[PDB]
Amino acid sequence: IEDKLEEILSXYHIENELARIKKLL
Amino acid sequence: IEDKLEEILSXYHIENELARIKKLL
Amino acid sequence: IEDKLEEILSXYHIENELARIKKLL
Amino acid sequence: IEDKLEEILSXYHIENELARIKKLL
Numbered sequence: 001i002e003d004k005l006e007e008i009l010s011x012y013h014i015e016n017e018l019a020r021i022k023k024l025l
Numbered sequence: 026i027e028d029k030l031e032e033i034l035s036x037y038h039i040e041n042e043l044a045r046i047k048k049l050l
Numbered sequence: 051i052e053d054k055l056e057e058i059l060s061x062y063h064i065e066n067e068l069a070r071i072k073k074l075l
Numbered sequence: 076i077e078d079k080l081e082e083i084l085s086x087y088h089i090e091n092e093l094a095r096i097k098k099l100l
Contacts, residue, residue, distance in 0.1 A: 004080040005029040024100045030054040055079040075099045
């Protein structure tokens with residue numbers, strides 16, 4: 001389990017990419 | 026652990042930014 | 051806790067909005 | 076519960092779609 005939460009935390013990137021997209025607009 | 030879920034909840038922002046992107050289109 | 055996972059599941063929407071964005075492009 | 080984390084892991088796609096969006100810009 002503490003494992004599955006670690007793999008979920010593997011979301012920061014999603015954020016980063018959203019920011020990048022905004023920059024692209 | 027209750028900790029790792031707190032850091033995952035640190036997603037609301039992802040939503041917000043998506044909405045912002047839509048506004049940019 | 052089972053609670054914090056319920057609030058995390060409150061991501062489907064993120065998907066939906068991404069799809070919508072694509073449609074906007 | 077290990078179940079709710081499995082359904083949360085059902086985020087990889089979110090990533091993929093973001094990448095696709097970038098490609099669309």
